[PDB]
């Protein structure tokens, strides 16, 4: 049944709760972002009000064929009224269209639900600074001190410099980047920009990107694979077998592949610096795992929480095991004691 951490007390509201059938008493279903674990269950047959960002409403209409009369897009950083309750959507620094939701409850409580986020100091100067938050429903994906990673900027710098070097040394190399959901668009867009190519991709991916209000997008992407030297593939296909195959398909236009797999965290972060990353190589194929995250590091999450000073924390990730739940509760207590709230 619908877990308690997807319910907002004192409202008729749920967050990312589309796979439980009709949730008894729910009058409005909020969707924080278009990733499958969060939208799972939506279709053209959905007949309840959905509240989301503009970008997420574009993807609902065009990819899942949700009927227009049930999509209620709201502008960011704007006080809005929903079934009698004041709400504000804030940028989550996750994938395109991803939001946090502030609820101002009739009784005076103030709840922030982060959806999925990468905490950033820039958040400390949004509408959040204006009032106190009693309850924080928190994206705890990487809530453990081993999870360190570089800034997005340092990782993109690494990818650009790597790709440019390779193709300038061999003008017949192909660059390939893996994807399986929206998010991490900067990786492939930044590489294509330095090389003076568009990014080539399936029709279904092209459609998805055209929903995202990215400026100048028609200049950056294409479905003509033959005209492009940066190709996007399903993540699954980013291995020596799927890449050898792909190379065959290009008909001797190319004699080398350099591939990028932008993962979440991986254990080489505990030891290695971005400067020091190396590919796995087989023949004329090289694959780079690069730690491009769109979730908070442990330290970024800790700063955000110690700034906000919530009275209660409700984790929304890693909640399925007792050891995970108990370890996270121990970090929350350390943070509150170190900061004094």
For Ni ion, give the closer residue by CB, 40 or 278.
Answer: 40
State which of positions 24-83 bind Ni ion (CB under 5 A): 35
To Ni ion, the closest distance from the beta carbon of 114 in angstroms equals: 11
To Ni ion, the closest distance from the beta carbon of 66 in angstroms equals: 19
Q: Is 191 helix (H, G, I), strand (E, B) or coil?
A: helix
Size of the site for Ni ion (CB under 5 A): 2
Cβ–Cβ contacts within 10 Å for residue 335, how many?
17
For Ni ion, give the closer residue by CB, 182 or 230.
Answer: 182
To Ni ion, the closest distance from the beta carbon of 216 in angstroms equals: 25
For Ni ion, give the closer residue by CB, 35 or 113.
Answer: 35
Phi first, then psi: give them for residue 121, nearest 5 degrees.
-55, -30
For Ni ion, give the closer residue by CB, 32 or 286.
Answer: 32
To Ni ion, the closest distance from the beta carbon of 289 in angstroms equals: 19
For Ni ion, give the closer residue by CB, 180 or 341.
Answer: 180
Separation between Cα atoms, residue 51 and residue 76, nearest integer Å: 12
Residues paired with residue 138 on neighbouring β-strands, in sequence order: 315
- DSSP state letters, 28-88: EEE-----HHHHTT--TT--S-EEEEHHHHHHHHHHS---GGGEEEE-BT--EEETTEEEE
Quick note: the x/- pattern for Ni ion over 180-209, rule CB under 5 A, is ------------------------------
SS (H, E, C) 103-153: EECCCCCEEEECCCCCCCHHHHHCHHHHCCCCEEEECCCCCCCCCCCCCHH
Pick the piece of the chain touching Ni ion (CB under 5 A) from 15-23, 56-64, 113-121, 243-251. 113-121
Q: Which two tokens stand for residue 197?
A: 């190519």
To Ni ion, the closest distance from the beta carbon of 38 in angstroms equals: 6
Identified binder of Ni ion from the candidate list 28, 39, 113, 116, rule CB under 5 A:
116
Q: Is the dihedral of CA 12, 18, 22, 28 positive or negative?
A: positive
Phi first, then psi: give them for residue 150, nearest 5 degrees.
-75, 165
Separation between Cα atoms, residue 291 and residue 270, nearest integer Å: 12
State which of positions 6-35 bind Ni ion (CB under 5 A): 35
For Ni ion, give the closer residue by CB, 198 or 295.
Answer: 295
Strands 285-290 and 256-262: parallel
To Ni ion, the closest distance from the beta carbon of 86 in angstroms equals: 26
Pick the piece of the chain touching Ni ion (CB under 5 A) from 61-69, 77-85, 100-108, 115-123. 115-123
| Letter string b/e over residues 222-238, b meaning 16 or more CB atoms within 10 A of that residue's CB | beebeebbbbbbeeeeb
To Ni ion, the closest distance from the beta carbon of 234 in angstroms equals: 18
To Ni ion, the closest distance from the beta carbon of 298 in angstroms equals: 18
Separation between Cα atoms, residue 256 and residue 39, nearest integer Å: 38
For Ni ion, give the closer residue by CB, 231 or 295.
Answer: 295
To Ni ion, the closest distance from the beta carbon of 15 in angstroms equals: 13
246 lines the binding site for Ni ion (CB under 5 A): no
For Ni ion, give the closer residue by CB, 33 or 231.
Answer: 33
For Ni ion, give the closer residue by CB, 116 or 300.
Answer: 116
Which residues of this protein are in contact with Ni ion, per CB under 5 A? 35, 116
């Amino acid at each position: 049944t619908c877990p308690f951490y997807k319910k907002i007390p004192g409202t008729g509201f749920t967050v990312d709760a589309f796979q439980y059938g009709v949730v008894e008493g729910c009058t409005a279903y909020f969707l924080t972002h278009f990733h499958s674990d969060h939208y799972a269950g939506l279709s053209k047959h959905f007949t309840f009000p959905v509240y989301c960002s503009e970008i997420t409403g574009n993807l609902l209409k065009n990819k899942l064929h949700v009927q227009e009369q049930y999509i209620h897009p709201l502008p960011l950083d704007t006080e809005c009224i929903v079934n009698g309750v004041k709400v504000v959507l804030l940028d989550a620094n996750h994938c395109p269209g991803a939001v946090m939701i502030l609820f101002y409850l009739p009784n005076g409580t103030v709840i922030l639900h982060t959806g999925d986020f990468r905490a950033d100091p820039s958040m400390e100067r949004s509408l959040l600074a204006d009032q106190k938050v009693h309850m924080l429903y928190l994206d705890t994906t990487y809530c453990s001190p081993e999870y360190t990673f570089p800034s997005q900027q340092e990782v993109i710098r690494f990818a650009i410099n790597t790709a440019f070097e390779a193709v300038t040394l061999n003008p017949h190399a192909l660059v390939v980047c893996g994807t399986y959901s929206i998010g991490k668009e900067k990786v492939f867009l930044a590489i294509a920009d330095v090389l003076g190519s568009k990014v080539g991709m399936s029709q279904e991916k092209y459609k998805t990107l055209q929903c995202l209000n990215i400026p100048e997008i028609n200049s950056l992407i294409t479905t003509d694979m033959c005209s492009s030297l940066v190709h996007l593939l399903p993540m699954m296909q980013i291995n020596f077998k799927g890449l050898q195959s792909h190379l065959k398909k290009c008909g001797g236009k190319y004699n080398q592949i350099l591939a990028f797999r932008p993962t979440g965290w991986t254990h080489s972060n505990k030891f290695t610096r971005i400067a020091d990353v190396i590919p796995q190589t087989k023949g004329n194929i090289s694959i780079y795992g690069i730690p491009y995250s769109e979730h908070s590091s442990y330290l970024e999450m800790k700063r955000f929480v110690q700034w906000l000073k919530p009275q209660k924390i409700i984790p929304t990730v890693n909640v399925g095991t007792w050891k995970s739940r108990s370890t996270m509760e121990k970090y929350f207590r350390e943070w509150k004691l170190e900061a004094g709230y």
